[PDB]
């Protein structure tokens, strides 16, 4: 059985929230 | 046929279930490619478990590198394939108004608005 979910990684998150344009909330 | 065509109703609640006995806290998204997209490269995945700490500006990213878009190559995130939700709401909050009844969360990709 293979796995149907890809669970998004802390590394590909921490890429992300490391790249300008950044996004700011409240 | 996209994921909703080819899974029932009762199935996907029962799916949406398995994730939550498994992941408590991740958000459940299913990612498919607009129908009358010709452009963009096609994503190899279609159903991602997404942190509730992450807003769609970060969802966004991660899905431009997985498809290795250049800076300059247009990418848009449809939630429902029609709302265009702030860049800046955390995925929770898109989840809480923007879920589907089965309880899982669609988006569709695409170059255009």
Request: hydrophobic fraction near 35%; glycine fraction near 2%; aromatic fraction near 8%.
């Given at each position: 059985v293979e796995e149907?979910?890809?669970?998004?990684?802390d590394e590909e998150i921490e890429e992300a929230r490391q790249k300008a344009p950044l996004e700011i909330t409240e | 046929?996209?994921?909703?065509?080819?899974?029932s109703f009762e199935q996907r609640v029962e799916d949406v279930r398995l994730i939550r006995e498994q992941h408590p806290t991740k958000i459940p998204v299913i990612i498919e490619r607009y129908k009358?997209?010709?452009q963009l490269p096609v994503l190899d995945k279609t159903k991602f478990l997404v942190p509730d700490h992450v807003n769609?500006?970060?969802?966004?990213?991660?899905?431009?590198?997985?498809?290795?878009?250049?800076?300059?190559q247009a990418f848009f995130?449809?939630?429902?394939?029609?709302?265009?939700?702030?860049?800046?709401?955390?995925?929770?909050?898109?989840?809480?108004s923007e879920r589907d009844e089965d309880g899982f969360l669609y988006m569709v990709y695409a170059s255009q608005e």
């Amino acid at each position: 059985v293979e796995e149907e979910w890809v669970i998004v990684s802390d590394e590909e998150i921490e890429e992300a929230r490391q790249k300008a344009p950044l996004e700011i909330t409240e | 046929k996209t994921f909703k065509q080819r899974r029932s109703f009762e199935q996907r609640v029962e799916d949406v279930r398995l994730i939550r006995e498994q992941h408590p806290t991740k958000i459940p998204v299913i990612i498919e490619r607009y129908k009358g997209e010709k452009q963009l490269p096609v994503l190899d995945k279609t159903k991602f478990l997404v942190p509730d700490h992450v807003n769609m500006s970060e969802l966004i990213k991660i899905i431009r590198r997985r498809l290795q878009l250049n800076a300059n190559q247009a990418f848009f995130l449809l939630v429902n394939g029609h709302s265009m939700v702030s860049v800046s709401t955390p995925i929770s909050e898109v989840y809480e108004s923007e879920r589907d009844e089965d309880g899982f969360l669609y988006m569709v990709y695409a170059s255009q608005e």
